[PDB]
Structures are given as structure tokens and as C-alpha cells.
Design a protein around this ligand. Structure first.
Ligand code: HEC
Ligand code: HEC
Lengths: 218, 53, 52
């Protein structure tokens, strides 16, 4: 367990010691100290492919339950928020899903929609980094990422937001994106700029083609 | 529950972003018609919202 | 309260009144939902009844 965690984090020197130190001290030049964040931070930052880079999402590195070992190691090193687990030894998947939607939608439009999007797609920020799309997001990582406060994202405490609020938020997020749009083909969830592009590229072309077919050139 | 609840200094984080609105305790919670209408009026105000970081 | 209950003694041999269904489960006109329920009771074409 703890020894296996040390093996998979420090003895597996490919991952930890090259940026944060064997004792999780934190080299000031490259990364942070990494001493006050709990196992949830590690679980989110590892299971979503945001692995050490040269940082957009990529394939995960550790998947064979050793993420639990890394989380145990970091939580033993220092306290912090922990992963919400199903009452059977596994991670909660549908128990986290709530029932209320109006309150969840209002909270999304009050604090979530600002950066990400109205419909949860990608959002635009300033000077490089951006807002990723929520389509490849899974609910446990959604809750853990909110509770963790990753780069450029405001950290959220469980004290200021009720657990029912998280359940409603994740329920609304999963409903909005996974539901079929009852308006035909979707156009990226953006404003009317792609709509105008589509008008100029399809309506104009077909209209002028029909005009040339009907009319004559002389 | 009341549309707005009071705020404590401990209920924040080192990088927390929140939205607050004036309360005016004489307003009261959203139970009576007058209180509900006053709460809606304070909700619909352009220059009301304030960030606290 | 917009509506109050009725007693047999509170009439006269030549008096007329207008009454509406009460349905006490709605409650008095204090909360928003009870207020809307009472108003929609008041907003009904086939509701009013004359007792003479
Ligand atoms: C320098 C290469 C690099 C290595 C190696 C690396 N990371 Fe990171 N990661 C970073 C940097 C730099 C940050 C600081 C914030 C950022 O850049 O997003 C970070 C952020 C984090 C965060 C979220 C921010 C925080 O304060 O907690 C966690 C959790 C984390 N690292 C854990 C790990 C774990 C676990 C490993 C071993 C699998 C690891 N790091 C190895 C680059 C690296
Ligand atoms: C612009 C400020 C900002 C706000 C406001 C914001 N986020 Fe984030 N969030 C970010 C950034 C930037 C990232 C991606 C950082 C990265 O990929 O390293 C992120 C990451 C995420 C992720 C992880 C996606 C993934 O694939 O890993 C989810 C889910 C998410 N945000 C949803 C939310 C929720 C829920 C809220 C409301 C609590 C929210 N966003 C509000 C900045 C913000």
C-alpha cells in the first residue's frame, strides 16, 4: 500500500521526483510544493491525462489502480479533499447524480457558464490558455476538478457549495450535453457567427447556382 | 430556501470567486408577496452585482 | 386573508351573498403558491355560486 505508493511515485522516478522532490518539497523553478492538496487533486490530474508535458488533455499514464496508490501517498504526506467513493470499495458513478435540475441549471449559468460555455462547449480566454469542452468529462472527475481548483480555475470549497449543489450541477451537465438537440444538426453551440458562415457558404452557393441554371449569360 | 443567505469570512478559499448582492435585513425571506417582490426587484438591478475575491 | 369561512347564523331572511370553493388544503394567502392557488380559484368562469 504505502510502500507500493512510494514505489509508484518516487521509485517510479519517471513521474514525481523530477518536478516536486522526493519528499514532495517542490522545486520552485518548475512546479509547486504539492504538500497541502489531497488525493483528489492527484486523482483528477492523473486520470484525465493531464500528465507531465513539455498542457492539453492526452492519454492517461497510470490506470491499473495505482492512481489510488498515488492518492494514498499524497494524502498521507498531507491532508486535503478525498475522492468520493461508492459504498462497495469502488468509485461512485450514479449515486453522485442528483434529481433537481432548475437549481443546478441556475448555478451553472451563474458560475459555470461564464468560462466554459452556455452549452458546455469550449470557451475562449485571454493570453494562451482556454476553456476545454465538457463533452469528454466524466462526473467523478467533474466533482473532483471543481473541488481541487486546477490551473486558471477558481478553487471551490465544499463549505460554500452544498453537496446537493454538486449533484444538481453534475446532473445538469450530463443532461445538457448528452441529450439530442431537437432542432436537427447542431452547429457547435456557438452564437450566430457559424450560422452566418453556413448561410454564406450554402445558401448563397445554391441560390447562385439555381440563378445561373435558370438564367443565361450574355 | 431563501434566495440569498448571509456570508461568513471562513467560508472562502485562497482562490475562490463568488457573487454577492445587497441583503437589507428588513427585506426578510421570500415568504410573503411583498418580500418576494422586493427580492425580485433587488435581483433585477444592473448595478447591484458585486464580486468578492 | 382573501376568503373566510361561513356560518349559518351570519345571514338574513332577505340577504344574498357570493361564495367560492375553499379547499382548505391550499392554505391562506401567505405563501406564493397558496396565493396563486387562491387567485386561480378566483379566476374561474364556472366557480361563483349565489346563496340566498
Ligand atoms: C515539470 C513536469 C511535471 C512533472 C514531472 C509532474 N508535473 Fe504536476 N504539474 C506540472 C506543473 C509545472 C504544475 C503547476 C501548475 C500547472 O502547471 O498546471 C503541475 C500541477 C500539478 C497538480 C495540480 C496543481 C496542484 O497544485 O496540485 C497536481 C495534482 C500535480 N501536478 C501532480 C503531479 C503528479 C501526481 C505527478 C507525478 C505523476 C506530477 N505532478 C509530475 C508539471 C509536472
Ligand atoms: C475561466 C475561469 C473558470 C471558471 C469560472 C470555471 N472554470 Fe472550469 N476550468 C478552467 C480552466 C482554464 C480549465 C482547464 C485547465 C486545464 O486543462 O489545465 C478548467 C477545467 C474544467 C473541467 C475539466 C475538464 C477536463 O476535461 O478535465 C471541468 C469539468 C470544468 N472546468 C467545469 C467547470 C465548472 C463546474 C465550473 C464552475 C465551478 C467552471 N468550470 C468554472 C477555468 C474555469
Amino acid at each position: 500500500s504505502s510502500a507500493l505508493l512510494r514505489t509508484g511515485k518516487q521509485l517510479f522516478d519517471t513521474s514525481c521526483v523530477s518536478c516536486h522532490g522526493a519528499n514532495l518539497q517542490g522545486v520552485p523553478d518548475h512546479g509547486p510544493s504539492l504538500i497541502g492538496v489531497g488525493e483528489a487533486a492527484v486523482y483528477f490530474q492523473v486520470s484525465t491525462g493531464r500528465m507531465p508535458a513539455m498542457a492539453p488533455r492526452k492519454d492517461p499514464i497510470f490506470d491499473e489502480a495505482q492512481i489510488d496508490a498515488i492518492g494514498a501517498y499524497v494524502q498521507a504526506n498531507g491532508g486535503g479533499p478525498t475522492v468520493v467513493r461508492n459504498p462497495d470499495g469502488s468509485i461512485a458513478t450514479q449515486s453522485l447524480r442528483g434529481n433537481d435540475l432548475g437549481r443546478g441549471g441556475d448555478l451553472f449559468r451563474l458560475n459555470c457558464a461564464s468560462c466554459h460555455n452556455f452549452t458546455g462547449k469550449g470557451g475562449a480566454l485571454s493570453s494562451g490558455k482556454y476553456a476545454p469542452d465538457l463533452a469528454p468529462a466524466n462526473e467523478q472527475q467533474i466533482l473532483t476538478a471543481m473541488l481541487t481548483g486546477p490551473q486558471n480555475m477558481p478553487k471551490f470549497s465544499n463549505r460554500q457549495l452544498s453537496f446537493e449543489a454538486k449533484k444538481d450541477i453534475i446532473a445538469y451537465v450530463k443532461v445538457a450535453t448528452e441529450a439530442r438537440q431537437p432542432g436537427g444538426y447542431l452547429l457547435g453551440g456557438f452564437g450566430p457567427a457559424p450560422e452566418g458562415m453556413a448561410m454564406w457558404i450554402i445558401g448563397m452557393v445554391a441560390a447562385i447556382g439555381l440563378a445561373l441554371w435558370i438564367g443565361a449569360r450574355s | 430556501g431563501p434566495p440569498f443567505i448571509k456570508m461568513r469570512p471562513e467560508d472562502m478559499d485562497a482562490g475562490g470567486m463568488e457573487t454577492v448582492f445587497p441583503w437589507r435585513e428588513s427585506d426578510g425571506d421570500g415568504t410573503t408577496v411583498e418580500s418576494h417582490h422586493k427580492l425580485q426587484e433587488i435581483a433585477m438591478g444592473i448595478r447591484n452585482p458585486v464580486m468578492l475575491i
